[model samples]
Target: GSLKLRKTALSECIAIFNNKPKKAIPVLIKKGFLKDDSPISIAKWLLETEGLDMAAVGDYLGEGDDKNIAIMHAFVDEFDFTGMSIVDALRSFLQSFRLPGEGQKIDRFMLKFAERFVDQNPGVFSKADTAYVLSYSLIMLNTDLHSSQIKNKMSLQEFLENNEGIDNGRDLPRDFLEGLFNEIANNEI
Candidate 1:
Protein backbone atom coordinates (compact mmCIF):
# COMPACT_ATOMS: atom_id res chain seq x y z
CA GLY A 1 0.00 0.00 0.00
CA SER A 2 1.26 3.49 -0.79
CA LEU A 3 -0.22 4.93 2.39
CA LYS A 4 -0.76 3.69 5.97
CA LEU A 5 -2.97 4.26 9.00
CA ARG A 6 -1.86 4.51 12.61
CA LYS A 7 -3.68 3.55 15.78
CA THR A 8 -3.01 4.28 19.42
CA ALA A 9 -3.90 1.88 22.25
CA LEU A 10 -6.43 4.59 23.19
CA SER A 11 -8.63 6.62 20.76
CA GLU A 12 -7.69 3.94 18.25
CA CYS A 13 -8.88 4.20 14.66
CA ILE A 14 -8.72 6.83 11.97
CA ALA A 15 -11.82 8.19 10.27
CA ILE A 16 -10.74 8.00 6.66
CA PHE A 17 -13.32 8.12 3.88
CA ASN A 18 -12.55 6.82 0.39
CA ASN A 19 -15.53 8.52 -1.20
CA LYS A 20 -17.65 11.57 -0.34
CA PRO A 21 -19.82 10.35 2.53
CA LYS A 22 -23.40 10.50 1.43
CA LYS A 23 -25.89 12.10 3.78
CA ALA A 24 -28.79 9.96 4.92
CA ILE A 25 -31.16 12.85 4.34
CA PRO A 26 -30.95 14.74 1.10
CA VAL A 27 -33.19 17.28 2.85
CA LEU A 28 -34.55 16.94 6.39
CA ILE A 29 -38.30 16.49 6.63
CA LYS A 30 -39.90 18.84 9.18
CA LYS A 31 -40.96 15.97 11.45
CA GLY A 32 -37.30 15.33 12.26
CA PHE A 33 -35.29 12.34 11.06
CA LEU A 34 -37.07 8.96 11.21
CA LYS A 35 -40.18 10.56 12.66
CA ASP A 36 -41.69 11.09 9.21
CA ASP A 37 -42.27 9.01 6.08
CA SER A 38 -40.83 6.01 7.84
CA PRO A 39 -41.84 2.76 9.52
CA ILE A 40 -43.99 4.89 11.80
CA SER A 41 -45.11 7.20 9.03
CA ILE A 42 -48.79 6.39 9.43
CA ALA A 43 -48.80 8.12 12.78
CA LYS A 44 -47.61 11.34 11.20
CA TRP A 45 -49.85 10.94 8.20
CA LEU A 46 -52.92 10.29 10.32
CA LEU A 47 -52.32 13.41 12.39
CA GLU A 48 -52.42 15.58 9.29
CA THR A 49 -55.34 13.95 7.50
CA GLU A 50 -58.56 15.46 8.92
CA GLY A 51 -60.75 12.34 9.13
CA LEU A 52 -58.07 9.97 10.40
CA ASP A 53 -57.62 10.47 14.13
CA MET A 54 -55.85 8.81 17.05
CA ALA A 55 -58.59 6.20 17.49
CA ALA A 56 -58.07 5.20 13.89
CA VAL A 57 -54.36 5.07 14.66
CA GLY A 58 -55.24 2.73 17.52
CA ASP A 59 -53.83 4.57 20.46
CA TYR A 60 -55.68 2.56 23.07
CA LEU A 61 -55.25 1.56 26.69
CA GLY A 62 -53.85 -1.77 27.81
CA GLU A 63 -54.93 -4.75 25.75
CA GLY A 64 -57.82 -3.03 24.08
CA ASP A 65 -58.94 -5.79 21.72
CA ASP A 66 -60.67 -3.39 19.36
CA LYS A 67 -57.71 -1.10 19.45
CA ASN A 68 -55.37 -4.01 19.05
CA ILE A 69 -57.27 -5.03 15.98
CA ALA A 70 -57.23 -1.49 14.67
CA ILE A 71 -53.54 -0.96 15.24
CA MET A 72 -52.78 -4.37 13.82
CA HIS A 73 -54.50 -3.25 10.64
CA ALA A 74 -52.45 -0.09 10.63
CA PHE A 75 -49.18 -1.93 11.02
CA VAL A 76 -50.27 -4.68 8.67
CA ASP A 77 -50.84 -2.22 5.87
CA GLU A 78 -47.47 -0.57 6.43
CA PHE A 79 -45.60 -3.84 6.45
CA ASP A 80 -47.50 -5.46 3.60
CA PHE A 81 -44.54 -4.84 1.37
CA THR A 82 -45.84 -5.74 -2.10
CA GLY A 83 -42.85 -7.76 -3.20
CA MET A 84 -41.34 -8.99 0.08
CA SER A 85 -41.55 -9.97 3.73
CA ILE A 86 -41.00 -7.89 6.87
CA VAL A 87 -37.36 -8.91 6.61
CA ASP A 88 -37.10 -7.21 3.25
CA ALA A 89 -39.01 -4.26 4.66
CA LEU A 90 -36.36 -4.19 7.36
CA ARG A 91 -33.68 -4.20 4.65
CA SER A 92 -35.28 -1.11 3.17
CA PHE A 93 -35.76 0.50 6.57
CA LEU A 94 -32.10 0.16 7.32
CA GLN A 95 -30.73 0.74 3.85
CA SER A 96 -29.57 4.32 4.38
CA PHE A 97 -27.30 3.33 7.23
CA ARG A 98 -25.25 0.88 5.23
CA LEU A 99 -21.62 1.58 4.32
CA PRO A 100 -20.43 1.18 0.71
CA GLY A 101 -19.28 -2.45 0.40
CA GLU A 102 -19.42 -3.79 3.95
CA GLY A 103 -22.55 -5.08 5.65
CA GLN A 104 -23.94 -4.66 9.12
CA LYS A 105 -25.24 -7.62 11.00
CA ILE A 106 -28.30 -7.32 13.22
CA ASP A 107 -26.55 -6.34 16.41
CA ARG A 108 -28.28 -6.05 19.82
CA PHE A 109 -29.49 -2.57 18.92
CA MET A 110 -31.08 -4.00 15.80
CA LEU A 111 -32.15 -7.42 17.13
CA LYS A 112 -34.03 -5.75 19.95
CA PHE A 113 -35.68 -3.43 17.46
CA ALA A 114 -37.00 -6.29 15.29
CA GLU A 115 -38.20 -8.17 18.36
CA ARG A 116 -40.16 -5.17 19.58
CA PHE A 117 -41.45 -4.47 16.10
CA VAL A 118 -42.78 -8.02 15.69
CA ASP A 119 -44.19 -8.27 19.20
CA GLN A 120 -46.18 -5.07 18.80
CA ASN A 121 -47.29 -5.67 15.22
CA PRO A 122 -48.59 -9.22 15.00
CA GLY A 123 -50.79 -9.41 11.91
CA VAL A 124 -47.99 -8.61 9.50
CA PHE A 125 -46.12 -11.78 10.28
CA SER A 126 -46.99 -15.33 11.23
CA LYS A 127 -45.15 -17.37 13.84
CA ALA A 128 -43.06 -19.01 11.15
CA ASP A 129 -41.83 -15.67 9.87
CA THR A 130 -41.00 -14.22 13.28
CA ALA A 131 -39.32 -17.43 14.38
CA TYR A 132 -37.16 -17.40 11.30
CA VAL A 133 -36.45 -13.68 11.58
CA LEU A 134 -35.56 -13.82 15.26
CA SER A 135 -33.21 -16.72 14.76
CA TYR A 136 -31.54 -15.13 11.76
CA SER A 137 -31.19 -11.84 13.66
CA LEU A 138 -29.26 -13.54 16.44
CA ILE A 139 -27.06 -15.46 14.06
CA MET A 140 -26.10 -12.26 12.25
CA LEU A 141 -25.77 -10.47 15.57
CA ASN A 142 -23.20 -13.06 16.58
CA THR A 143 -21.35 -12.76 13.32
CA ASP A 144 -21.20 -8.96 13.55
CA LEU A 145 -20.07 -8.98 17.16
CA HIS A 146 -17.16 -11.22 16.31
CA SER A 147 -16.35 -9.95 12.87
CA SER A 148 -13.09 -8.00 12.61
CA GLN A 149 -14.57 -4.66 11.55
CA ILE A 150 -13.73 -1.35 13.19
CA LYS A 151 -17.16 -0.94 14.74
CA ASN A 152 -17.60 -4.49 16.03
CA LYS A 153 -16.73 -2.54 19.22
CA MET A 154 -15.31 -5.31 21.37
CA SER A 155 -12.70 -7.79 20.31
CA LEU A 156 -13.06 -11.49 21.15
CA GLN A 157 -9.59 -11.47 22.65
CA GLU A 158 -10.36 -8.58 25.00
CA PHE A 159 -13.66 -10.17 25.95
CA LEU A 160 -12.18 -13.64 26.44
CA GLU A 161 -9.34 -12.14 28.42
CA ASN A 162 -11.65 -10.11 30.65
CA ASN A 163 -13.79 -13.08 31.41
CA GLU A 164 -10.80 -15.44 31.27
CA GLY A 165 -12.11 -18.34 33.28
CA ILE A 166 -15.67 -17.78 32.10
CA ASP A 167 -15.98 -18.33 28.32
CA ASN A 168 -14.93 -19.46 24.82
CA GLY A 169 -15.65 -18.63 21.11
CA ARG A 170 -15.87 -17.74 17.62
CA ASP A 171 -18.47 -19.76 19.52
CA LEU A 172 -18.91 -18.09 22.88
CA PRO A 173 -21.56 -19.03 25.44
CA ARG A 174 -24.70 -16.90 24.98
CA ASP A 175 -24.66 -15.14 28.34
CA PHE A 176 -20.90 -14.70 28.06
CA LEU A 177 -21.22 -13.14 24.63
CA GLU A 178 -24.18 -11.06 25.74
CA GLY A 179 -21.98 -9.19 28.17
CA LEU A 180 -19.83 -7.99 25.34
CA PHE A 181 -22.77 -7.46 23.02
CA ASN A 182 -24.64 -5.28 25.48
CA GLU A 183 -21.52 -3.28 26.15
CA ILE A 184 -20.95 -2.83 22.47
CA ALA A 185 -24.53 -1.76 21.93
CA ASN A 186 -24.16 0.87 24.63
CA ASN A 187 -20.92 2.13 23.03
CA GLU A 188 -19.30 1.58 26.41
CA ILE A 189 -15.65 0.72 26.67
Candidate 2:
Protein backbone atom coordinates (compact mmCIF):
# COMPACT_ATOMS: atom_id res chain seq x y z
CA GLY A 1 0.00 0.00 0.00
CA SER A 2 2.95 2.28 0.61
CA LEU A 3 4.16 4.40 -2.28
CA LYS A 4 7.47 3.30 -3.73
CA LEU A 5 10.47 5.62 -3.64
CA ARG A 6 10.32 5.92 -7.39
CA LYS A 7 6.72 7.07 -7.22
CA THR A 8 7.57 9.49 -4.47
CA ALA A 9 10.50 10.48 -6.57
CA LEU A 10 8.21 11.06 -9.51
CA SER A 11 5.92 13.18 -7.36
CA GLU A 12 8.91 15.16 -6.28
CA CYS A 13 9.70 15.40 -9.96
CA ILE A 14 6.27 16.82 -10.62
CA ALA A 15 6.73 19.40 -7.92
CA ILE A 16 9.89 20.59 -9.62
CA PHE A 17 8.15 21.48 -12.85
CA ASN A 18 5.19 23.27 -11.29
CA ASN A 19 4.48 25.21 -14.46
CA LYS A 20 3.90 22.36 -16.87
CA PRO A 21 2.68 19.36 -14.90
CA LYS A 22 0.07 18.75 -17.58
CA LYS A 23 2.87 18.20 -20.05
CA ALA A 24 5.01 16.19 -17.68
CA ILE A 25 2.61 13.48 -16.46
CA PRO A 26 2.24 11.91 -19.87
CA VAL A 27 5.97 11.41 -20.26
CA LEU A 28 5.87 9.19 -17.20
CA ILE A 29 2.85 7.31 -18.56
CA LYS A 30 4.67 6.74 -21.82
CA LYS A 31 7.44 5.16 -19.82
CA GLY A 32 4.69 2.65 -19.03
CA PHE A 33 4.69 3.71 -15.41
CA LEU A 34 2.52 6.73 -14.69
CA LYS A 35 -0.73 7.98 -16.15
CA ASP A 36 -2.27 11.22 -17.43
CA ASP A 37 -3.29 14.36 -15.49
CA SER A 38 -2.88 13.48 -11.81
CA PRO A 39 0.47 12.85 -10.13
CA ILE A 40 -1.05 11.42 -6.94
CA SER A 41 -3.29 9.11 -8.93
CA ILE A 42 -0.40 7.96 -11.09
CA ALA A 43 1.74 7.57 -7.98
CA LYS A 44 -0.88 5.30 -6.43
CA TRP A 45 -0.80 3.20 -9.55
CA LEU A 46 2.99 2.85 -9.22
CA LEU A 47 2.67 1.77 -5.60
CA GLU A 48 0.19 -0.91 -6.53
CA THR A 49 2.09 -1.88 -9.62
CA GLU A 50 5.86 -1.36 -9.93
CA GLY A 51 6.66 -0.47 -6.33
CA LEU A 52 4.97 -3.54 -4.96
CA ASP A 53 6.63 -5.99 -7.29
CA MET A 54 10.20 -4.90 -7.74
CA ALA A 55 13.39 -4.47 -5.82
CA ALA A 56 16.84 -3.55 -7.00
CA VAL A 57 20.36 -4.14 -5.63
CA GLY A 58 20.47 -0.54 -4.39
CA ASP A 59 17.78 -1.16 -1.78
CA TYR A 60 20.00 -3.71 -0.06
CA LEU A 61 22.68 -1.11 0.54
CA GLY A 62 20.76 0.68 3.25
CA GLU A 63 20.53 -0.45 6.86
CA GLY A 64 16.96 0.87 6.90
CA ASP A 65 17.28 3.44 9.67
CA ASP A 66 15.81 6.95 9.75
CA LYS A 67 19.17 8.64 9.45
CA ASN A 68 20.19 6.61 6.45
CA ILE A 69 16.78 6.80 4.88
CA ALA A 70 16.66 10.53 5.45
CA ILE A 71 19.96 10.97 3.68
CA MET A 72 18.80 9.30 0.48
CA HIS A 73 15.50 11.10 0.68
CA ALA A 74 17.21 14.41 1.17
CA PHE A 75 19.51 13.88 -1.76
CA VAL A 76 16.49 13.71 -3.98
CA ASP A 77 14.45 16.36 -2.20
CA GLU A 78 16.83 19.27 -1.64
CA PHE A 79 17.37 20.42 -5.17
CA ASP A 80 14.80 21.76 -7.60
CA PHE A 81 16.05 19.46 -10.33
CA THR A 82 12.96 20.45 -12.27
CA GLY A 83 14.04 20.83 -15.85
CA MET A 84 13.33 18.35 -18.66
CA SER A 85 11.64 15.28 -17.17
CA ILE A 86 11.87 13.28 -13.96
CA VAL A 87 14.13 10.80 -15.73
CA ASP A 88 16.62 13.39 -16.91
CA ALA A 89 16.95 15.11 -13.55
CA LEU A 90 17.40 11.79 -11.82
CA ARG A 91 19.95 10.82 -14.40
CA SER A 92 21.91 14.03 -13.78
CA PHE A 93 21.80 13.63 -10.02
CA LEU A 94 22.70 9.94 -10.20
CA GLN A 95 25.61 10.74 -12.45
CA SER A 96 26.77 13.36 -10.00
CA PHE A 97 26.51 10.74 -7.27
CA ARG A 98 28.81 8.27 -9.02
CA LEU A 99 31.78 10.62 -8.78
CA PRO A 100 34.29 9.61 -6.05
CA GLY A 101 35.71 11.03 -2.82
CA GLU A 102 33.85 12.90 -0.07
CA GLY A 103 34.82 16.23 -1.48
CA GLN A 104 33.86 18.90 1.02
CA LYS A 105 33.76 21.26 -1.90
CA ILE A 106 30.65 19.58 -3.28
CA ASP A 107 28.80 20.34 -0.08
CA ARG A 108 29.49 24.01 -0.65
CA PHE A 109 28.84 23.57 -4.32
CA MET A 110 25.37 22.16 -3.77
CA LEU A 111 24.34 24.93 -1.41
CA LYS A 112 25.08 27.51 -4.05
CA PHE A 113 24.14 24.98 -6.71
CA ALA A 114 20.53 24.71 -5.59
CA GLU A 115 20.07 28.46 -5.14
CA ARG A 116 19.68 29.23 -8.81
CA PHE A 117 17.02 26.58 -9.12
CA VAL A 118 14.97 27.88 -6.19
CA ASP A 119 15.45 31.40 -7.44
CA GLN A 120 13.95 30.47 -10.77
CA ASN A 121 11.11 28.64 -9.02
CA PRO A 122 9.87 31.70 -7.04
CA GLY A 123 7.09 30.61 -4.64
CA VAL A 124 7.80 26.90 -4.89
CA PHE A 125 10.31 26.86 -2.00
CA SER A 126 10.22 28.54 1.38
CA LYS A 127 12.21 31.73 1.70
CA ALA A 128 13.30 30.83 5.24
CA ASP A 129 15.17 27.71 4.19
CA THR A 130 18.85 27.72 3.25
CA ALA A 131 21.32 24.89 2.67
CA TYR A 132 19.75 22.31 4.91
CA VAL A 133 18.72 20.35 1.86
CA LEU A 134 22.25 20.34 0.57
CA SER A 135 23.42 18.96 3.90
CA TYR A 136 20.98 16.10 3.64
CA SER A 137 22.09 15.34 0.10
CA LEU A 138 25.66 15.18 1.37
CA ILE A 139 24.57 12.78 4.07
CA MET A 140 22.85 10.58 1.48
CA LEU A 141 25.96 10.50 -0.67
CA ASN A 142 28.07 9.56 2.36
CA THR A 143 25.56 6.99 3.50
CA ASP A 144 25.49 5.51 0.03
CA LEU A 145 29.19 4.77 0.46
CA HIS A 146 28.53 3.21 3.84
CA SER A 147 25.66 1.16 2.43
CA SER A 148 28.13 -0.51 0.13
CA GLN A 149 28.96 -3.00 2.88
CA ILE A 150 30.94 -5.24 0.55
CA LYS A 151 32.92 -2.30 -0.68
CA ASN A 152 33.65 -1.38 2.92
CA LYS A 153 35.97 -4.39 3.03
CA MET A 154 37.93 -3.34 -0.01
CA SER A 155 40.59 -0.68 -0.49
CA LEU A 156 39.02 2.77 -0.65
CA GLN A 157 39.95 3.39 -4.26
CA GLU A 158 38.89 -0.13 -5.21
CA PHE A 159 35.54 0.39 -3.54
CA LEU A 160 35.18 3.67 -5.38
CA GLU A 161 36.07 2.00 -8.64
CA ASN A 162 33.69 -0.92 -8.18
CA ASN A 163 30.78 1.32 -7.32
CA GLU A 164 31.77 3.74 -10.01
CA GLY A 165 28.32 4.22 -11.41
CA ILE A 166 26.77 4.79 -8.00
CA ASP A 167 29.55 6.65 -6.23
CA ASN A 168 32.20 7.35 -8.78
CA GLY A 169 32.37 9.70 -11.79
CA ARG A 170 30.72 7.23 -14.14
CA ASP A 171 27.26 8.41 -13.15
CA LEU A 172 27.68 11.75 -14.89
CA PRO A 173 27.55 12.46 -18.61
CA ARG A 174 30.87 11.11 -19.92
CA ASP A 175 32.71 14.28 -20.89
CA PHE A 176 31.39 16.74 -18.30
CA LEU A 177 31.74 14.32 -15.39
CA GLU A 178 35.22 13.35 -16.49
CA GLY A 179 36.24 16.95 -16.81
CA LEU A 180 34.89 17.75 -13.38
CA PHE A 181 36.73 14.79 -11.88
CA ASN A 182 39.87 15.75 -13.66
CA GLU A 183 39.56 19.27 -12.32
CA ILE A 184 39.01 18.06 -8.79
CA ALA A 185 41.79 15.48 -8.96
CA ASN A 186 44.19 17.93 -10.54
CA ASN A 187 43.31 20.67 -8.01
CA GLU A 188 42.08 22.77 -10.86
CA ILE A 189 38.99 23.74 -8.91
Report, for all candidates in order, the number of backbone clashes.
0, 6
Candidate 1 per-residue C-alpha lDDT over 129-186 given as tens digits, one digit per residue, 9 for 90 to 100? 3433443443345446655475664454544444332211233345644553454444
Q: Name the runs in model 2 displaced over 4 angstroms.
A: 1-80, 83-91, 94-103, 128-147, 150-189
RMSD of 2: 17.1
**Model 1 ranges off by over 4 Å:** 1-69, 92-189
Model 1 poorest ten-residue lDDT run? 13-22
TM-scores of all predicted structures: 0.24, 0.25
Q: Residue-wise lDDT of candidate 2 within 149-168, one digit each (tens)?
A: 54342333432333334322
lDDT of model 2, residue 154: 30
lDDT of 1 at 47: 31
What CA root-mean-square deviation does each model show from the true structure?
17.8, 17.1
